[PDB]
Point group: C4
Chain length 196, copies 4
């Protein structure tokens, strides 16, 4: 069993690193099943040459909406759950990670089906926050996924491989994704169907 982190806290990624370069999110987001739940996921890269202390991830849904009373909100913001409750948004960013927002009753994608997706006018804003160990200062990295950028029924290619006592990152695959069998019903719909 090859350790990921050594006893003295130095990680075993990127042989011969030194722990500006900007951080990178995947260009696309994918939606597909993980242990019977539908999930929207996007990938978030590390910083090749520095740790990010107190790193956290959050996402906003930006979407215009009209309240049952006729109030119209341009570009309304609401928070997408990417680990907030269990502390799984407190990232340990030492190699690219797939962040997953599980689509449940409280998720805004609850009723969005495959067909219905390309119709919706929305944008996921993703936001990484954390203190760069090296620099001492607080960073923020952002990115965005509009409708046409969320690929339904795909999964992220793995990029992490163990080679000679270090784990190397094939950054070429970073944005690459592949197709997999995935129902085209909405989450709400899978739930109804399952629950009888």
């Amino acid at each position: 069993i090859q350790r990921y982190v050594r006893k003295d806290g130095k990680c075993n990624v990127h042989h011969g690193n030194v722990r500006a370069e900007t951080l990178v999110f995947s260009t696309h987001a994918v939606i597909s099943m993980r242990d019977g739940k539908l999930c929207l996921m996007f990938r978030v890269g590390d910083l090749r040459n520095s740790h990010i202390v107190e790193a956290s991830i959050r996402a906003k849904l930006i979407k215009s909406k009209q309240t049952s009373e006729g109030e119209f909100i341009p570009l309304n913001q609401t928070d997408i759950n990417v680990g907030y409750y269990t502390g799984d948004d407190r990232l340990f960013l030492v190699s690219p990670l797939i962040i997953s927002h599980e689509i449940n009753q409280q998720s805004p994608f609850w009723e969005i089906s495959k067909a219905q997706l390309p119709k919706e006018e929305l944008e996921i804003v993703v936001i990484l926050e954390g203190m760069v160990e090296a620099t001492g200062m607080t960073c923020q990295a952002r990115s965005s996924y509009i409708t046409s950028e969320i690929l339904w029924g795909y999964r992220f290619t793995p990029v992490l491989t163990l080679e000679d006592g270090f784990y190397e990152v094939d950054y070429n695959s970073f944005h690459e994704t592949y197709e997999t069998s995935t129902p085209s019903l909405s989450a709400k719909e899978l739930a109804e169907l399952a629950n009888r």
Copy 2:
């Protein structure tokens, strides 16, 4: 669909910006229905020329009170819920936002009706907190809404408009508000009535 945030994280607000100027809250707060719940809301502006990382919002109710045991607390503080539980107080401040505190059983405005409002001796203190990307340092901006400053049965004028691939802010409307049909019962009261 015109993006709000570009792939590399630069937002599309305030054409030709550069991301001291002080931040601004609305002068008044409004109370009115959103999807069948009564809501107290106030607006909170952005910083025209800088992002605010790890920006959060909180509000205190300052109100003198007497405990059933006769203890009298001058200017007692209690926390107003403006997204604390779901992470909707973790703001993405890139254009003025209406913050909403939904008036539920645990809200102190639960039993405050329209008539009853101008009678109560209270003050909402609003507090924005966050690190100014530019400056590196932690900012705090505060403001206040006393009774006469909460307008019952109004809504905030929208200020956000898309113009030629950027979203511009009509800062003139920032404080402006308009009237709308709104019941004059208290939340507790609407709840009773609805629940039979």
Copy 3:
């Protein structure tokens, strides 16, 4: 109605202030009823000449204990609830505040009666944390309450008075406390008795 905080965010405490001096906790802690719940409370002062951004309060119970399996923990730590869940530990420190830990089933003082108190070998450690606006840096102030320092059946004298459009703090009363009718049963006990 004299405002506590002005529209531009400047508070109306300590006429002619300028917003080292150390922060101060009360020398004693008191235990007494507030709206039918028993409460341990201690007072925590402000900084006469500076705000404290992102100010929070927490408390630890330090008490030696033996697990049902015979493991003996010297000076075991467990967290005392002083607003953690509702965000009432996120302080707005602009005049001395009484912090209250309500003694409920999950509080370690649940079964501690008046008689039983002076028998217990314990220490409350109180810890204020926050960034000094002036200094830019993170402060921590601590203090402690051992058994003999928790006064049962008392209340904190008020210190806050409005004088000519500013609220002045009578710092003399800061530590002073007074007696009030308070049952000498433990919380667990009041609960049983009440619940029949």
Copy 4:
């Protein structure tokens, strides 16, 4: 009763201290019963010559996994509960502490028995985070526990002793541990058995 923390906030540990040296986690982790619940625990040392403000602890489980849909995640991360919900991960690090993750239904060790442990391919990554009072800057200390490093059915030797009005730390015992009667069933198993 010898105080642990004095009225003015100075702690009574390490006679003649001055409040680089690196922080230290125990080399091993132990698993054993505390008040009828099974617990994985590891020890985390203080900094002999400085306090750590806003100190927090978190742990990740790193373990490769395959989703019921065949997706294979190398070195999957999931958060281990070490006080997140009650605020017991907000440490008061003034002498080495045993951090305890109670193994319940939501813990990944739920179904891991004594026999089954040495078979599993996993790694606990532990991460201390906090601002060094002295230095002004944010620190991160990390360490790791692979399978062979978690000792089943052991307890941490105590290291804290009161000597002449100060509490001294026998740093020799810091990593030392001892054996105790402990069932070899998994938590899930003890639960079933107990619950009839």
